[PDB]
Amino acid sequence: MKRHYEAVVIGGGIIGSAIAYYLAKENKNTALFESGTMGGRTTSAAAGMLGAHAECEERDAFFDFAMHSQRLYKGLGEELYALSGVDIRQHNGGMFKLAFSEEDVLQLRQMDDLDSVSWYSKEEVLEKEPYASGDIFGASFIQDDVHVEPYFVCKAYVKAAKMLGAEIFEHTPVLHVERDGEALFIKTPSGDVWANHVVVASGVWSGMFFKQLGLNNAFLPVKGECLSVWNDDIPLTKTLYHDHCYIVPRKSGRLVVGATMKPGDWSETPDLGGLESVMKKAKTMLPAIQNMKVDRFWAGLRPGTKDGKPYIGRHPEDSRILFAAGHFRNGILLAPATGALISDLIMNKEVNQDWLHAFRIDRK
Amino acid sequence: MKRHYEAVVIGGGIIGSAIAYYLAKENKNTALFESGTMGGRTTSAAAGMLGAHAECEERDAFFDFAMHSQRLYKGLGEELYALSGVDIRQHNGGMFKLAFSEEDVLQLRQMDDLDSVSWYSKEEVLEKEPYASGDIFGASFIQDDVHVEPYFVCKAYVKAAKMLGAEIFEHTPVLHVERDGEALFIKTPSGDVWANHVVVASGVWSGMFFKQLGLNNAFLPVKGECLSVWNDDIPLTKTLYHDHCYIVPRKSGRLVVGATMKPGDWSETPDLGGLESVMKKAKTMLPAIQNMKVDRFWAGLRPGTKDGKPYIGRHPEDSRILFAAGHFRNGILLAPATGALISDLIMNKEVNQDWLHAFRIDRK
Amino acid sequence: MKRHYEAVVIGGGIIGSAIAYYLAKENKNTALFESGTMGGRTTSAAAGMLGAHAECEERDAFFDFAMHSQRLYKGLGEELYALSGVDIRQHNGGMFKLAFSEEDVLQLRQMDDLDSVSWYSKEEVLEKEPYASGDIFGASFIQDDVHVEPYFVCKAYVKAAKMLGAEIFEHTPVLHVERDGEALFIKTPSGDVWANHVVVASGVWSGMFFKQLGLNNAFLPVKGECLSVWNDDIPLTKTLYHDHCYIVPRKSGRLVVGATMKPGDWSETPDLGGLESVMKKAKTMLPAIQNMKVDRFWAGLRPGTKDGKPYIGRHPEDSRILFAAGHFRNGILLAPATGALISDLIMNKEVNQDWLHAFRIDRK
Amino acid sequence: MKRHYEAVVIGGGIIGSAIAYYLAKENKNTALFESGTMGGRTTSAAAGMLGAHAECEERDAFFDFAMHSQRLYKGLGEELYALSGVDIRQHNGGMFKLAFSEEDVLQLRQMDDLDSVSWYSKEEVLEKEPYASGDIFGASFIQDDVHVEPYFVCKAYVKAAKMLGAEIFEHTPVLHVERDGEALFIKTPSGDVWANHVVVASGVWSGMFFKQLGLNNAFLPVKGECLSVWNDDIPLTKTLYHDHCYIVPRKSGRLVVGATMKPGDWSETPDLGGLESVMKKAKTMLPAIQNMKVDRFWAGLRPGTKDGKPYIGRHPEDSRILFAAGHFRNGILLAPATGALISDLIMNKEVNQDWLHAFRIDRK
Ligand SMILES: Cc1cc2nc3c(=O)[nH]c(=O)nc-3n(C[C@H](O)[C@H](O)[C@H](O)COP(=O)(O)OP(=O)(O)OC[C@H]3O[C@@H](n4cnc5c(N)ncnc54)[C@H](O)[C@@H]3O)c2cc1C
Numbered sequence A, B, C, D: 001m002k003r004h005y006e007a008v009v010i011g012g013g014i015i016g017s018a019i020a021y022y023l024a025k026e027n028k029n030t031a032l033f034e035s036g037t038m039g040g041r042t043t044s045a046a047a048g049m050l051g052a053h054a055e056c057e058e059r060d061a062f063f064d065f066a067m068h069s070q071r072l073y074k075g076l077g078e079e080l081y082a083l084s085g086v087d088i089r090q091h092n093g094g095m096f097k098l099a100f101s102e103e104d105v106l107q108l109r110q111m112d113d114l115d116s117v118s119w120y121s122k123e124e125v126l127e128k129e130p131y132a133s134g135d136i137f138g139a140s141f142i143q144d145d146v147h148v149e150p151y152f153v154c155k156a157y158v159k160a161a162k163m164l165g166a167e168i169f170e171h172t173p174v175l176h177v178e179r180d181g182e183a184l185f186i187k188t189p190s191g192d193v194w195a196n197h198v199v200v201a202s203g204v205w206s207g208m209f210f211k212q213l214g215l216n217n218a219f220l221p222v223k224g225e226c227l228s229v230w231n232d233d234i235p236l237t238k239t240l241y242h243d244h245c246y247i248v249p250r251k252s253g254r255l256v257v258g259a260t261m262k263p264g265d266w267s268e269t270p271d272l273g274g275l276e277s278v279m280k281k282a283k284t285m286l287p288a289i290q291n292m293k294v295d296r297f298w299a300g301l302r303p304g305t306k307d308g309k310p311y312i313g314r315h316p317e318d319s320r321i322l323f324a325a326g327h328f329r330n331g332i333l334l335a336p337a338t339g340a341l342i343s344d345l346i347m348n349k350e351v352n353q354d355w356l357h358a359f360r361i362d363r364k
């Protein structure tokens, strides 16, 4: 552990890992501190949908940022594999957003004018996916709302960062950021470090740092429970999505299934009632899943903010300190654009003012 | 591996392990052959209830054998620990057989005249176990229908048998039993061995040997799926039982919960619909289970016979061959009595004639 | 389960799975029977090297068959993914066969005349792989001796076969093949089935079937123990190979490490002494591995034959019966060529006579 | 969660769980806060030896406290089971401290004058334990240095505390302790709570709180790596111990084997070189272990202090604050005595002054 770094990142989920990579790529001398292991919390619980078209209700700067991040994934697998040897496991089948009523149909068809979406009738859906529930009314097909394996996107980013000279410290929680002197310094149980810039990317745990730095921004966990099964018997290429729940086919032959929403629960392991509810929902979407062998079950904590949008930007009173936290159901999707925007700010490059405004820290 | 043994046991579940122990205690030179690892199939799936009082319909020979076997468990843990160093994990809390209707109350109170049983009102049940469902009408308390951990009963028996001289061959499937000569022989992939007596204790897989030896006795698997949770928050001492389903409190703090009944299914891991149904049923018996963290899921194959009773006895044309298989939901309970009976028969000792008839091979 | 099939395959490792696929692709009505789960035995233990240049000592028909099978892998990932949705996880880094003495150098340089191999000096090796042991003398670089994840090659083959109409029966061991009538029929615990052709692909367990069919061909297990670690800190692209031991970098960031050779041991789980020896060897090849976190440990049984070559062909007295078993350290490599050769025979196509001879059943 | 508690415990390992129990038994309104799950860190890594006689150098106050704590285990299993339903799994076989040189024999025989100990010759050791290494010179037999399973001691204490009224908050890290007011308060991400007394029992992570409260007491992790195997073949009743390494027979049939010593390492999973060294050492103590099937690998962080002794006592400037942390290799042994001492201090009862001095916070 060196005494001085140009940039220090606090937290090693997908968000901090991406930021470290983009900083290292700009030749900033960078360190990352993670309390546990890289990718070991909410990042490991995520399905991995690049779900930009759960964001086009409202068609605003948040949708625009989401589509930009989706485009950034285009060459990303190759770029990171060349440096890390780690495959992000991209699956380009796309998504059927299912309807189970005429009310569902009217809501989904509001997206018809987007070039990125096409409406499929009940019969057109079943020709492509014969095992989708016969109670559907049709589905919006979203070709580019693909998926990746999030733990491996995170490991790819961090290994690439390391090969570009970033210094990674697992099992090293950050206790304090100060703030006082002409440089920031951070305190850890194994010594102290100075930095020209500090980035807080500690997910749902980020509130301690806002408060330490004179800011009241808070986070509420919304727990989500999931399971996986082996699909050894039927074809399924597209992701199936309904009412924030999903069945995602991975290239291992597993299906990933979720999820509950349990506000205010900080526990990271699933309950019996939660898993029961996940099973019940999945069966309404793909009836044949009742016969599939169960693999695993898990949970994670979504980092909920007051208004439901992330904080991505500078401390309003100190440009040396930055935050990137509060990606509720979209942190995998938004990892590259988040990483790029934070790196650009630290480098004093011009950035998109609509995104700078939308994600700013002081939203009064 | 020797050329000849006085007795050979085929199968290393709880039934075969018990038989080898009783035989070695009689100073029979004994070997046991098991296809995989000891206790690795149906024995590992069982809850471990000593459920004699799910067996008192017609209060007959089968009920008498069950009560005898239950009594044989009295000093067993201490006996086997002295030779093996393995604890069978006996829990003497007893069982509440619950009622959820006036029909249930009638059926259950027919046991009131037995010394083994006492009726509890709704209010008396909730005094002892406040978290039992408030929809009950009361319960029968059976003090002696206690529980053990069946994998460790199996390991205790086999290690005890080893210390007394038995030779145990894991990863050694038996392919054939030959009758034609003065003594028997068996064939394995590691070589062929002679034996004075052979005992078939291969569970639901026993059909192959019956057929090989001129008998049409057949087995149907009835698969059962179970789950466990951690009970970190409430007191629960007694087992809860209703309509062949159960919640069994272990001394680790886990609850064992089951079970489905799927006839004709030879698969040994649980599917999604089965686990969903187990969770649904458990919640009606103990509502607070909804909030408990899930630990593990599993399944096993009950060995079903034409009339639901096991075959424990000699081949009717050859007293050198014996069978001990088809213990449907009662093989943990019946392991000691089954072992003692087969060993007594090999020794040509007098045995109970009602039991010998009830479990005979030739039932037409 | 139907009464009649055109072709029946006994065993569901990678070999039987491939054969079922090629038969289904020829529109033969096919069934496969597997005792347990698909790919669940020796196939799951394998590293997955396509190791043809461990076969060019002797430069004979076996080397030629191995190179042919390696070429068959070229478009295989894509062909199977299109039908199954399962990714075989191919890694095209290639292999350094290391030397640690001048005697090693002379032996490896015997391959220099092959276009598929280039000799690298000590310094040339370390420029590509700086963490390979500094005690090496150089290495042969074998560009096309790449690797795949064998469990997933097997799952891809079987899911593709199913989509082409093959019928797959897990948890259905075959008890007997007969032989007697104008058609073969096979016996299982859940009923009997007739077939115009039967293929034995039961790996190290295949001996029972040879013997049932009047043939004395035998198999000896050679157990191999392995482990995996997480490589989160150093670059490693090429497989490292020395004296039948190896370090294989997977695209998850894990390294796969092996292996012991324990003749006559049928146990399928690793010993303490075996794993210790694997650790010791790995450290001599890649010293930095001592600091890497351990992931998993496992074992499997290599199917050893008398002369060390597989049996791939017809029963000499009955062209309806075929065998494909005894691939010692090369069954992953040889899976496509094995599958193709068996399918071609069943279809009465002309085949390569050198390969037909080399792998024939009656090698006197 | 209430606004105020009479006592608050920070940390839910074995030390904190014990403290909460003794406090609730005194009818103190008590809460305990734990960052993750109860017993989930160093407590889960421990073998569970009650090793008082690895503590008799200078036969001093520390040895006396160890013997007192060992005596407190006498009725503990039964006491905690009555309230919790959780078995601590005590094994009363005792310990052989082995000698492999004349130097070892001299050191060990200095304990001969204690009532707790008896010397055994080589021949007398091998009579009792035939599989101990034949290279030994004899061993000291310590009957009372028995073992328990530490995770279940922890779970028993906490569940017992709950039944007596303690309120337990998992997934609730404490960020700060404030001294300035009439009562203390603590800050958590779920809100801030007042308390009359606060006890810091956060193991190797306790340094943060010392520093927060004006004290420079520091902690260094000494990581230890262990493994387990299945002992299915030999008798082993006594624990074997040599040079801080051990083989501990559990009543499940497992052996627990350890351990390395890696100062300065905060990582909590084992590396390859560490496990290799544990296997090598175990084979010198019990050669037959080479053939045993491996079960599990793990690691944990010993909380090392400047002089190797724990801090158990009051903050020297504020009697409302207490610490109980830095139990290096003896925290399972010392849990009962540590709990009773902290509880007695909170109650203002008279305590042993030698012990109060030996473990005081201000050692300069
Ligand atoms: C059920 C579920 C499914 C989801 N599915 C999707 C999906 O399909 N698509 C999508 O885009 N999003 C999805 N999400 C959302 C996504 O998981 C999150 O937005 C994302 O993982 C947040 O990333 P992060 O790096 O901020 O947080 P985390 O992964 O939680 O990482 C934060 C890290 O900070 C560390 N930390 C905390 N405190 C400190 C400290 N003091 N010092 C050092 N380190 C510290 C932690 O140990 C942790 O590793 C899903 C979420 C859930 C729970």
Ligand SMILES: Cc1cc2nc3c(=O)[nH]c(=O)nc-3n(C[C@H](O)[C@H](O)[C@H](O)COP(=O)(O)OP(=O)(O)OC[C@H]3O[C@@H](n4cnc5c(N)ncnc54)[C@H](O)[C@@H]3O)c2cc1C
Pocket (backbone or CB within 6 Å): B010, B011, B012, B013, B014, B015, B016, B033, B034, B035, B036, B037, B038, B039, B040, B041, B042, B043, B044, B045, B046, B047, B048, B049, B050, B051, B172, B173, B174, B175, B201, B202, B203, B204, B205, B206, B223, B224, B225, B226, B258, B259, B299, B300, B301, B302, B303, B324, B325, B326, B327, B328, B329, B330, B331, B332, B333, B334
């Ligand atoms: C969900 C579930 C819950 C249950 N709960 C209870 C309960 O609470 N109480 C109770 O009393 N009972 C219970 N049972 C029933 C109990 O599990 C069985 O009756 C009992 O395990 C049967 O033991 P076994 O030794 O006959 O069979 P198994 O344990 O299946 O052993 C047979 C052995 O034979 C071996 N074998 C097969 N073929 C060969 C061969 N060719 N050569 C060598 N070896 C071979 C197998 O590998 C296997 O290990 C339960 C069952 C299920 C499924």
Ligand SMILES: Cc1cc2nc3c(=O)[nH]c(=O)nc-3n(C[C@H](O)[C@H](O)[C@H](O)COP(=O)(O)OP(=O)(O)OC[C@H]3O[C@@H](n4cnc5c(N)ncnc54)[C@H](O)[C@@H]3O)c2cc1C
Pocket (backbone or CB within 6 Å): C010, C011, C012, C013, C014, C015, C016, C033, C034, C035, C036, C037, C038, C039, C040, C041, C042, C043, C044, C045, C046, C047, C048, C049, C050, C051, C172, C173, C174, C175, C201, C202, C203, C204, C205, C223, C224, C225, C226, C258, C259, C299, C300, C301, C302, C324, C325, C326, C327, C328, C329, C330, C331, C332, C333, C334
């Ligand atoms: C440590 C290790 C590493 C290896 N690494 C490599 C490598 O890198 N490259 C390579 O090419 N090879 C490697 N091998 C060799 C390779 O694993 C084998 O050659 C290959 O898996 C054999 O395939 P199989 O289908 O014949 O056997 P298996 O995978 O063992 O399949 C046979 C199947 O038959 C079933 N069966 C048995 N009896 C019956 C019955 N009565 N009825 C129905 N089914 C039955 C079994 O359940 C089993 O699933 C390695 C082997 C080991 C052990």
Ligand SMILES: Cc1cc2nc3c(=O)[nH]c(=O)nc-3n(C[C@H](O)[C@H](O)[C@H](O)COP(=O)(O)OP(=O)(O)OC[C@H]3O[C@@H](n4cnc5c(N)ncnc54)[C@H](O)[C@@H]3O)c2cc1C
Pocket (backbone or CB within 6 Å): D010, D011, D012, D013, D014, D015, D016, D033, D034, D035, D036, D037, D038, D039, D040, D041, D042, D043, D044, D045, D046, D047, D048, D049, D050, D051, D172, D173, D174, D175, D201, D202, D203, D204, D205, D206, D223, D224, D225, D226, D258, D259, D299, D300, D301, D302, D303, D324, D325, D326, D327, D328, D329, D330, D331, D332, D333, D334
């Ligand atoms: C390999 C190994 C073998 C050992 N074998 C033995 C043995 O045989 N016998 C013996 O007596 N001892 C043994 N020990 C030592 C023993 O494990 C320890 O002395 C003991 O576990 C310490 O318990 P603890 O409660 O202090 O620490 P821990 O169990 O580490 O508990 C501390 C708790 O504090 C929590 N925490 C930290 N920060 C906060 C916060 N801010 N807010 C809330 N909670 C927080 C943590 O999450 C943790 O659960 C062994 C140790 C090792 C590593």
